[PDB]
Design a protein around this ligand. Sequence first.
Ligand code: HEM
Ligand code: HEM
Ligand code: HEM
Ligand code: HEM
Ligand SMILES: CC(C)=CCC/C(C)=C/C=C/C(C)=C/C=C/C(C)=C/C=C/C=C(C)/C=C/C=C(C)/C=C/C=C(\C)CCC=C(C)C
Ligand SMILES: C/C=C(C)/C=C\C=C\[C@H](OC)[C@@H](C)[C@@H](OC)[C@@H](C)CCc1oc2c(O)c(OC)cc(OC)c2c(=O)c1C
Lengths: 108, 534, 402, 135, 94
Amino acid sequence: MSLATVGNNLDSRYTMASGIRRQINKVFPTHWSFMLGEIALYSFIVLLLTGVYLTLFFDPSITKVIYDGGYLPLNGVEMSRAYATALDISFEVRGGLFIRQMHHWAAL
Amino acid sequence: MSLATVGNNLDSRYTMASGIRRQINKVFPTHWSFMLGEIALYSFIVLLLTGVYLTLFFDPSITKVIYDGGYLPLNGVEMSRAYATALDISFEVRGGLFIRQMHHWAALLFVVSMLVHMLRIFFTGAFRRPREANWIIGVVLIILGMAEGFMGYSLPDDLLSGVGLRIMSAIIVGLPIIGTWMHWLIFGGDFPSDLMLDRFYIAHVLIIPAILLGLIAAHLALVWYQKHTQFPGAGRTENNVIGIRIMPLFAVKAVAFGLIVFGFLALLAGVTTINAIWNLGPYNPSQVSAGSQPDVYMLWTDGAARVMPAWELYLGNYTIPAVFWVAVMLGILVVLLVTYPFIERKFTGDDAHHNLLQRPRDVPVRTSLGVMALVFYILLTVSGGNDVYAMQFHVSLNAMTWIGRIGLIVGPAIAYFITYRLCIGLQRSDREVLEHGIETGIIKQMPNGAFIEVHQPLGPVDDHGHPIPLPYAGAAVPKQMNQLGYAEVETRGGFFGPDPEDIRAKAKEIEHANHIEEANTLRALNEANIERDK
Amino acid sequence: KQYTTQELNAMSNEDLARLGTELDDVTIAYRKERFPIANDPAEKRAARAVTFWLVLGIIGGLGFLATYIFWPWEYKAHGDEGLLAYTLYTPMLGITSGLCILSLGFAVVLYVKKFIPEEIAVQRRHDGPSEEVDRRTIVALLNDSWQTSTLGRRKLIMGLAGGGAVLAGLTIIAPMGGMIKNPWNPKEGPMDVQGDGTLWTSGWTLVENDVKVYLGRDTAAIAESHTDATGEHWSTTGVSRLVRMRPEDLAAASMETVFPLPAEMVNDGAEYDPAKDVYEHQMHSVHGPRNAVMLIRLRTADAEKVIEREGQESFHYGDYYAYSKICTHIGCPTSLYEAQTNRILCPCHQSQFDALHYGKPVFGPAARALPQLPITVDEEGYLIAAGNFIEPLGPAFWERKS
Amino acid sequence: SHTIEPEIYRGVSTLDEPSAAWGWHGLKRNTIQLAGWISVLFMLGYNFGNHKGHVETIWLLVITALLVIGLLIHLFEPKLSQVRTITSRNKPVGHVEPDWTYDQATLTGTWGNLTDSQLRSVNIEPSRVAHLRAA
Amino acid sequence: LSSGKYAPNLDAANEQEIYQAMLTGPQNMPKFSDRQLSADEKKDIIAFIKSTKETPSPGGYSLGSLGPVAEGLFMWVFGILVLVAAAMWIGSRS
Ligand code: HEM
Ligand code: HEM
Ligand code: HEM
Ligand code: HEM
Ligand SMILES: CC(C)=CCC/C(C)=C/C=C/C(C)=C/C=C/C(C)=C/C=C/C=C(C)/C=C/C=C(C)/C=C/C=C(\C)CCC=C(C)C
Ligand SMILES: C/C=C(C)/C=C\C=C\[C@H](OC)[C@@H](C)[C@@H](OC)[C@@H](C)CCc1oc2c(O)c(OC)cc(OC)c2c(=O)c1C
């Protein structure tokens, strides 16, 4: 396997070996409750990914508009663009409801 | 003040004394052109702060409204919420126009400072090993900054900016085999669309700034870790760094240069108009203006579209539009910029660990490639604004298009030739001084009537009086006598009168001693470096 | 070597500093004070230089805050009272703020450049490969971890784990297909005055739905501000953005921008209703992506020498011709009708179309002739679209024939 | 006179270009050839576009003609021989000029064999030099 | 425009000259009869032209209102040069 070359480049350019060796040997205690902070961290990661997704379909404007979209039990109703694009996430985007649901559950 | 308690608590809690001693003792080489990266940093910080200010007043929506704001010459006009809230930033917020123009001037400064910084890096050779990573991420940074400014000025939804978006859309549909689908993905539909301004807005304020900041962070961390390069000079080796420490000198100088940058942008932001969206009106697909052009850091792309001939393939049921080759050109020159260190290592065969820099005269192939690329980019940039040039200098438009076309071959070539020959000439001038000594400018006449010029040698001499020629050392050679200090003033005082002669004599003695010992320490360090090389 | 507390106490503060720098392989080669003479006149001379810019930093900051609070900042139009005061608000903001911040920066630069000592400091580098023991030992630890795991032996668990890894990656990124949209699926509902939302159509396709579509000129009208006891209201109820236009209107060598105006959205002439709200729909028509049409009237001397295209004979009506105002290069308006040369010029990349050679490009990066609209006049003598274009409008794309 | 000996780096000799050790010198003849030729092809392609005029064509074509004869003489170098004529009372190559001024100053060499009347005609009384001129 | 033609700066014209420019179609300018662009429309066009030619910019010097080219030519030449001067005032030479 070619790894001899790869490492040779990296270390030669960054004097890398001693630092990463100090890092890979770092000890961690393994009580179960010391996992709990990781849960928050991973939740936060999910929140960022799903959040950026939701920004691709959301219009934060308060300007009023008559709704015409996927959810027919609000067709002809006047609403702000924020509510309208939330509804369009929920019903016009394939998988959009799933992602908004995941974003909110991850917040909790 | 009881700083002892603060320091003791912090140290007892973090064990930080050694780690912080290491940072206040770090050394930086202090050539002037090592400040060109700093400008890009400071303008970026300005861009961040002024940007957040603008987001408190801006609505990025393509929903339409009838205008009823401050600027009366557009009241009663149907326009998007984006254009309306940009007008409200410009006219109904106190100091809003100031912060808008400061933001735009900071954008221009950010991009051009990245350009001239990259040119320092290129012409001095700071990209080569071990420092290629900073080159790749820096090319990425300049590209993302360009995209950022494009998306940024596309936001206010005026006529000119929307024509820019139209051109983007037209170029993305033209791509084989997938342009139509890419367009419908990016824009969510046909152009204009509902979510285009929302997607450009969140790309502009969140996504691209985040990548830009993360890569600036990685970039500065690598620059701090791999200590900075330096030019050759007395005492300077591959294995050291000569300059000033972080504490007190360099940190204060950085703060002060940052203040200068901030104040210069503040000034620009007041005394010169930029963009002026209220003259352009709102975007309409059926309108256009003669002075089109994108922003300056995009004019090269525009020029590439103007100089291209109308070369199209019909295959026959499918079509390759003429602008596809413009995309190919941009791809080629991006790839060649980002992969240049490996090109140079292929064709030079150099692969050593380099910590000293090269004066551009001493590496003439690179300097000539650089100037020829500078001329190719200049002619693309002037090809972009070629109709403004034509209007403003009484040149035919079509003449300017053909000037652009032919220039993009003959300009780079002539530039290569002239640059190469000037480089070799500067080398020869330096070698003249190291061979025969500084030409003082004094001409004496000897008893036989010979006019001889008096030379000052920089080294030993033979018994004939002729200098023993010194080897070139990659450093700057003094060319005139005043560089050695023979013009230095020897009176001392204010503009309107002298000091007392006691103080002046004492001060001149002290200054002479200073110069002698500075020369001595650099000479001793020079000898020590020879000894380290055995 | 280490130092006991007694030895560190025995030292002077400069000796401790020297030790401090040498612990990082830094050495101060040279360092000297700026003003060694005891009561130098030059030091007071330098202090006054620094205080000058600090005084102006204070003056500029206070002047900025005065300008920012009390200078009349609010908008004035031409001819208003206090126009000049308004035009200078932003200028004064910037010159005062620049005074302040630049003067502070200059004070600090001068202070460095003539009070803090000058020094040459030399730091030794530690770069290149590492010290070989660390290379051998890190490789030993990583190799130990891989061989320790025993995962290299188990090709099935490795293959399945990689397959599940890549498939989970697909599961993560698959919702990005909420952005994918078939460009050939039409827009929802029936066809609109902007078309069906595909790259084929436009508003002029409505002729195929048996709709009468006039050529309509833009009146550029704006909303009107009515005002009454219940407030002030900008309205558009009796206002037409697009109005029909007649063949007498354009002189020879005139050009008019016209848009599709279906007969249902007209509100002009003797059949004008002062409460017929049509401004919204006509605006929707003016903003159609490829709706704009360039309607030119040639001179008779020019029409005597106009060259027709196959199948586009009889698209014109007399001396009136009609082309798509969308450039065939990458989609700008082809607005510049050089009236004498009869060449339509695009201000984006300088393409030139010959209005006397069926719009064929004669210069620039365009390769296709401008599409041509068939037009005529109706029983009341208004210009109308006699048909649809026979080409796809706008720039080129991969799925286009010719 | 003294100067350091020559040396060569990557085929660039230090006399023709100093600093050959210090950086990328060179750019070989074949690659200048390739650049010129392929850019000449890109020049000729410009003629094919949709344009109707021919000021453009004549510009393109002379610039191609000049680039082409340039590339030709760059490939087939036309060296010429040193001339070996002797025109207008010049002297053959091996001649060694005296310093006429040193002769005039010291009355030797070309100013050696002056007569009594001639020395008298350059304001030197011949008694002043009779002892100093050689036997 | 093409081949050495150009739409001139409108600053030099007066109001009657603007009206007659529209009415007469001077050189390669398209004519605009009073049937095409009504009298009130031409009054409005003259109003816009003169109010834009007479008002000052609130944001400082207009740079001749040439848009991104001129604004670029100011920062990318002058603007970078003064900060290069500052970098040399704050740094060292060779
Ligand atoms: C999103 C928020 C947070 C994240 C991602 C996070 C993450 C972590 C992680 C991963 C650890 C180490 C492993 C562990 O102990 O679980 C840790 C430790 C710690 N956390 Fe947090 N935490 C968060 C919030 C908090 C809060 C709310 C507190 C207290 C008010 C806190 C205080 C601490 C302290 C003091 C430690 C050190 C514990 C130790 O060393 O044993 N953190 N955190
Ligand atoms: C970069 C980070 C984030 C982005 C880009 C983002 C984006 C968004 C967007 C666009 C919405 C639109 C409203 C909707 O979908 O209904 C939303 C809703 C929401 N966000 Fe975020 N978000 C981010 C981070 C967070 C974080 C860190 C939290 C919690 C601490 C959070 C909590 C919520 C909640 C609870 C909702 C409401 C969801 C719903 O009602 O459907 N978000 N977010
Ligand atoms: C998180 C950082 C940023 C935020 C929040 C931000 C925000 C904004 C917003 C909201 C606008 C809307 C138009 C206006 O109000 O005038 C704008 C304009 C603009 N932005 Fe940004 N921006 C950021 C970073 C940048 C960067 C890094 C650049 C350049 C590399 C940039 C270049 C521009 C430009 C050129 C404009 C047009 C200015 C104008 O409309 O006059 N921005 N910015
Ligand atoms: C916003 C973008 C950038 C910022 C903020 C930035 C910042 C800096 C700073 C402060 C330095 C050290 C001081 C100096 O040498 O001037 C530096 C050095 C460097 N820069 Fe950048 N830079 C940026 C973009 C680039 C680009 C575009 C390139 C090249 C393509 C690049 C390559 C380098 C390299 C190789 C060094 C190391 C110089 C040396 O070690 O001698 N950077 N950068
Ligand atoms: C910063 C910003 C904003 C932007 C930027 C962007 C980018 C990415 C850019 C880029 C750029 C670049 C990279 C560029 C480049 C360029 C180049 C390199 C070019 C080149 C060219 C070349 C050529 C044209 C060449 C030519 C040649 C020739 C012609 C030659 C000739 C020769 C001859 C004649 C011979 C001589 C000799 C004798 C005569 C003897
Ligand atoms: C990595 C990048 C990301 C994530 C995001 C954004 C990407 C941005 C692209 O660049 C990188 C983008 C600028 C570019 O894409 C080919 C196109 C707009 C084409 C450039 C472009 O613009 C023009 C323009 O704007 C105008 O305005 C008034 C006018 C123009 O002619 C008069 C042009 C023009 O002739 C061209 C070629």
